[PDB]
């Protein structure tokens, strides 16, 4: 089995390790972050929105057992000072959101694990994957590499279909997203100065930024510079949805076509509804992406039309499936 | 003599517009009708989850409610050509029952003595619907019957003329992340107009749901009829919108700049405009009928060819409600 | 099999036949309400609080195909035009909320059915059962029977371990209690005229009542008239927490003898926590009342002593198990 | 000639404390201290999801930020005692920051220059806690630090002192259900103080939590030190709380209007009474300390003995910083 260090035991790094038990071939050994062990094994166990972990859980010396399996844990905040050679870590999924670049990532390396799978966008000379996208482009030579975002992995494979069948012009995109652990409870200063991260996550509206979009051509170069927009974090605790606005080349587009042509695309990572589902109806679901065929629209003015269509995605889940898969691909070359 | 408003549906509308009412010398609310009693109805206007508790004092007493020493009279009927208007000499009926969103069903206030009514919501019919401060000056004063549009048409409108005026709107989509609202379920039940996705949990979910106001915004701004569509994403804030437009314009080399300064001279008491951060929460209970959000547009270009996106923040309860009482002082005014 | 009608498929009528499912005995033949197929189906295929459910669900003619298995749903507001006797209906589980009475109930047996578990609380002749506190006062010849609410499941294995082991001379108690379908998703009037249940259930701390306290003395009647109190709804969907202060009998009692009665006491029906557990914790679980330990207090004053304790349940799906082998253990006799 | 104030903390209390300050003569704030820079400290006095946006003009200037013309210090300095409190000649330090709420730590400003220290919180040590109009009588003005309680002791204290006054306290629990605050996680994740509740998504849980109202009430009640104790449960209400107190009493008869008008007489500015049946929205933004609700007043009865219940409203921001800055005037005045 390849062995799996997880830094950063939040939201992503313990959605992770619930599914790597799902997985043979991995095993997570061990577990870094900044607290007891009393409270790794409390928020394993218990999950506010994706429910009660199903096995048992202990607090013993090293760490804690996960049904009978021992996970070593640490409470180190510089990684170049873990144990990985000691361990034998094959992969670090770095979940903690503060070694997003490919220079920041290198230290797991120096402290002894062989690769390195990052829980986000990642700036530098790396990989960036959205699984059943562009996982192939990787050879397994790769030492770190981004498993992008969740917004990224619900985009992708609506972006590719519809450059692929229809040519895409340009477009624009808003996530409509669940709040996030980067948010404040309550209207507060933001560390990195954010002035609506400051703002009650559960209590508003709030427009923010994601390079989802931007940055697409990581992920899809064909189409790199033609999308762009951001989000709006709303008060659902997990569950999102990506509305995306395009102008295509092909010129006759029907809802048909669209929905047809991401219907026939459709795989573990790439799902498709026609059920009026709302945004609870995704909490846990392992798809990457989930067209919703309900709500395409083919905006038509003489010979000039605007196509809009989105995805759900459960932000956690979702985009914690999705790295996972990319993990297990990675960790098999 | 000041205007005699009577306010039929003592609802989240009716009710702020009673508040706003008290704002706004020149008109008096003389009757509210409601299904309840005046116990609720006077509780209702007191205390307010989102909008505040009301300044005033607010005291039951027989014929409904007296409110800072001035009384209100209140009534139970669900029919509305049943009131009293003629006896009570109403000059205006603010429709806000949700229910007679018709110009023949809102004309029973008319056979029961109004003289005017003005709807709360969009309409059916031949009659004017109206966004103060875009097409009010449309109204001649011998209507009857008015429709005030929506909270999401007020939001849109302005937005929409600007970006025609300025740029030629070719065509454009539009999505309001937008408040939950009185017609969605607390919890996951049957739905009375057999909608499954106004029948989920109101404050527990992202849910679809359809709009009419960028498919009839033809009817405030006839040079755009048939230009726009798109729908609503609600969400669980209790009140406080955002509408969120992606277009494409004739004019060609279009900046974010050029945008916002031509939103920004098109600001009124109407059309607000902001460059700060803000959020949802800091629009409840303004009285702008639609806040451009500069901070919020994008152009996207490749080659010649460009998608335009801005996005404007609206009360969908106190900026409607400013905006419907703007168009009755100057529907009553003439 | 036990053919079992199920009217109202609302939270409770849904989530009882997702556990029927779970148990050899009992089959759902037949689900009456007042919508279509299509929704019916969509919202027990769909659950915001209680996660998709697993099997697959398909409109056909009569009404649902669940797990190839067929439902037969009806849309008939009037219970007794049920077609009950034709259907051969052992047991109907009462779940609209507007048969909460022996002899309104006694219409689905004039329907046919042979006998009514009613989902709540419930007025007339009949026994209130708490399952694995009372059901044994059942011997099967009962045609209606109440499942008591929630909060009365999550009491009274507590306050029968209490006054067992320690003699309760008087006790209160709050329910902090998740919002349910009878309140508004904005403030409004309220058909019952409730000036709080009329207020956004998602916004507020709500004060509101309840008799699991008062009655009581139904499922455990050496304890009537000794208990009292009400309950605060708060902003989640589901799961509550009831929390009792009590007098005792017994003078020298200390945190650890109450926990470990209450252990001692532990059961399918009543589970026991050391966990630092909380709301979310307790969505879908099976037992009626979780103890929580952790939440357990002994003021003493000289020889006095105010004892305070708490337990957890899903007001949706404890209170769906309890009434699932309440209705298993009904229909098994006769 | 105006009592200068720094505000160490400018976060929801200190804001509240600053906007609250502006109403109040011979009371100026000088200086504010915090971690982030000047556009967030500006950004967040001008927005408040819950208190509403800030009435005033906020603009950000070189040294910090002009307030309706009045100039703001700022400063971004974590350790207290380097501070430029002798330069600006700080007569009162208001401790807002949560990290100084024992007498020997928050002793750092004094060494900065600062005469005095009021800390916004309960605090460990050598001092004086003071709940306005229950006991800040007890300052002469020669303390140099001072704690002013927390929200959940301003709420308490008058409607404990009133019972104990007029029917002698024996004993009594008390819960406070409590909207979430700033030291509780968004999402469940480590929480810094190894609490497994706090940890836990605050808006999406009924969380039991722990608060020493109850257990140190004899700090500003000292004939009832020992009587009452009890906790809390956070619920997904972004302010507003509400405080359950459990009661025997030595006085044998009482009613629920004995205790009610007993309640009614002891109020003031510091205590509010109501009976009308509001909800936690209602007190978000009040200035009582605490607001008695005489509907939720009960009395259990069973022979000659009785449990009696009362339930206090508070805004634990506004209400909080009502009497913070009270007892902030009144300590500055000495
Ligand atoms: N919907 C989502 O939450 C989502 C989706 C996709 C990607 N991500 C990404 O995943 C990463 C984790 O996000 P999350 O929501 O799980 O965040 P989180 O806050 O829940 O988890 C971060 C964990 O890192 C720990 N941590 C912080 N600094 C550390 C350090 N130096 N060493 C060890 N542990 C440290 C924290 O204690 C915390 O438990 C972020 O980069 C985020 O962008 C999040
Ligand atoms: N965000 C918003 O709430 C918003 C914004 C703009 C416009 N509107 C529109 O205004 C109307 C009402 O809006 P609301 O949200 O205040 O609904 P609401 O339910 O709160 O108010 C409707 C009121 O009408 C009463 N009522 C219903 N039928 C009646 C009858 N036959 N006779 C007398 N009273 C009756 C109801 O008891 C209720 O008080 C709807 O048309 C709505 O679309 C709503
Ligand atoms: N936490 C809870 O939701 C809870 C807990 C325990 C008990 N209960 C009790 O169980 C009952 C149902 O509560 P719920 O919360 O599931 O309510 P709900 O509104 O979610 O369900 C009631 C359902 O009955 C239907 N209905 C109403 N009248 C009908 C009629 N005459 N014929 C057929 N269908 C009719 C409605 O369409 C609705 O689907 C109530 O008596 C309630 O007190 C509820
Ligand atoms: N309901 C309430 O919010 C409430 C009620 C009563 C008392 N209190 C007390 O008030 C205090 C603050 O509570 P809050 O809710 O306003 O929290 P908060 O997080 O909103 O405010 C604390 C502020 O202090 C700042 N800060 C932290 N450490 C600092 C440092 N060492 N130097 C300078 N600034 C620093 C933070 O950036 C933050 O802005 C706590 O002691 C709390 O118990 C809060």
Not at 23 to 30: D, I, N, Q, R, Y
Not at 97 to 119: C, M, N, P, R
Request: net charge negative; with cysteine; hydrophobic share 40%.
């Amino acid at each position: 089995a390849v062995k799996v260090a997880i830094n950063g035991f939040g939201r992503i790094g313990r959605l992770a390790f619930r599914r790597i038990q799902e997985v043979e071939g991995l095993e997570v050994v061990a577990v870094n972050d900044l607290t007891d062990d009393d409270m790794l094994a409390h928020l394993l166990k218990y999950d506010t929105m994706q429910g009660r972990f199903t096995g048992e859980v202990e607090v013993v010396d090293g760490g804690f057992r996960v049904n009978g399996k021992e996970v070593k844990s640490f409470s180190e905040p510089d990684a170049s000072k873990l144990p990985w050679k000691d361990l034998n870590i094959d992969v670090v999924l770095e979940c903690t959101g503060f070694y997003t670049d490919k220079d920041k990532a290198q230290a797991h390396i120096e402290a002894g694990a062989k690769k390195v799978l990052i829980s986000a966008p990642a700036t530098g000379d790396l990989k960036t994957i959205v699984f059943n996208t562009n996982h192939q482009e990787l050879d397994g030579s790769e030492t770190v590499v981004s498993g992008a975002s969740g917004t990224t992995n619900s985009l992708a494979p609506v972006a590719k279909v519809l450059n692929d069948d229809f040519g895409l012009v340009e477009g624009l995109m808003t996530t409509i997203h669940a709040y996030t652990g980067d948010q404040n409870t309550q209207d507060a200063p933001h560390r990195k100065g954010d002035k609506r991260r400051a703002r009650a996550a559960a209590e508003n509206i709030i427009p923010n930024s994601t390079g989802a979009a931007k940055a697409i051509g990581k992920v899809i170069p064909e189409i790199d510079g033609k999308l762009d927009g951001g989000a709006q974090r709303v008060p659902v605790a997990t569950g999102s949805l990506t509305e995306l606005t395009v102008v295509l080349e092909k010129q006759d587009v029907t809802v048909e076509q669209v929905n047809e042509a991401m219907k026939n695309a459709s795989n573990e990572s790439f799902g498709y509804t026609e059920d009026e589902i709302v945004s609870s109806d995704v909490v846990g679901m392992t798809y990457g992406s989930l067209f919703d065929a309900t709500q395409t629209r083919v905006m038509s003015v003489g010979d000039r039309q605007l196509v809009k269509v989105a995805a759900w995605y459960d932000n956690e889940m979702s985009y914690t499936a999705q790295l996972v898969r990319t993990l297990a691909y990675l960790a098999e070359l």
